[PDB]
UniProtKB/Swiss-Prot annotation:
Protein name from the UniProt record: High frequency lysogenization protein HflD
Residue spans crossing the bilayer: none
Keyword Lipid biosynthesis tagged: no
Family as reported in the entry's similarity comment: Belongs to the HflD family.
SUPFAM superfamilies: YcfC-like
Keywords assigned: Cell inner membrane, Cell membrane, Coiled coil, Cytoplasm, Membrane
An individual GO BP term: response to heat
Subunit organization: Interacts with CII protein from phage lambda.
Length: 213
């Protein structure tokens, strides 16, 4: 309800989970299938009753994001594989701010997302058809609002249109988490001023998820 770090940490973890799945897809051509399922579902899972409900109601569904958030906030090379994750997280945050400023854009986005029912009737969420349809929302509605997010990895892997579609759909999940992040009190300054609170909160959730350790 009132602004709190538990909810802000969860929404940031959703942004970071998109960043990490993109990195996996760009280098390997495949990613954590359970995490991708959670992130893609967050796009279509209508009228959530809490922040955690966006991600299916269980903290375990954000494990990838919560681990990623720890390195994005505290790992400080501006280089290495870890720095790719920071670049993607910040680029999604920048693009979301452009989206939320652009008159009519969030309305267009919602209408396009609900229109995925045109294909969901016949095809599963993780199918090529749906991945392509999700990618087209990102490319048609969001990406034009700034210079492209630069995705690198294995150049030949990234030549696959199926990989490109999975990457764009995962970016759309990242934008959707960034909208939530701002709705629950996150933002540029709040992040500058709360890196430890967020880090501590993420490590507490990861401990809660691991009673055997």
């Amino acid at each position: 309800g009132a602004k709190n770090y538990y909810d802000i940490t969860l929404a940031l973890a959703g942004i970071c989970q998109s960043a990490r799945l993109v990195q996996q897809l760009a280098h390997q051509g495949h990613c954590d299938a359970d995490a991708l399922h959670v992130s893609l579902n967050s796009i279509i899972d209508m009228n959530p009753s809490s922040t955690l409900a966006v991600f299916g109601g269980s903290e375990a569904n954000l494990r990838v994001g919560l681990e990623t958030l720890l390195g994005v906030l505290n790992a400080s090379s501006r280089q290495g594989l870890n720095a790719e994750l920071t670049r993607y997280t910040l680029s999604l945050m920048v693009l979301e701010r452009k989206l939320s400023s652009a008159k009519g854009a969030l309305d267009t986005l919602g209408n396009r997302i609900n229109g995925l029912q045109r294909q969901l009737e016949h095809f599963d969420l993780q199918s090529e058809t749906l991945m392509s349809a999700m990618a087209a929302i990102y490319v048609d509605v969001i990406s034009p609002l700034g210079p492209r997010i630069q995705v690198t990895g294995s150049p030949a892997v990234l030549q696959s249109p199926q990989v490109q579609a999975k990457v764009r759909a995962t970016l759309l999940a990242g934008i959707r988490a960034a909208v939530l992040w701002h709705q629950v009190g996150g933002g540029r300054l709040q992040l500058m001023f709360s890196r430890n609170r967020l880090t501590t909160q993420a490590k507490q959730i990861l401990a809660h998820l691991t009673p055997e350790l």
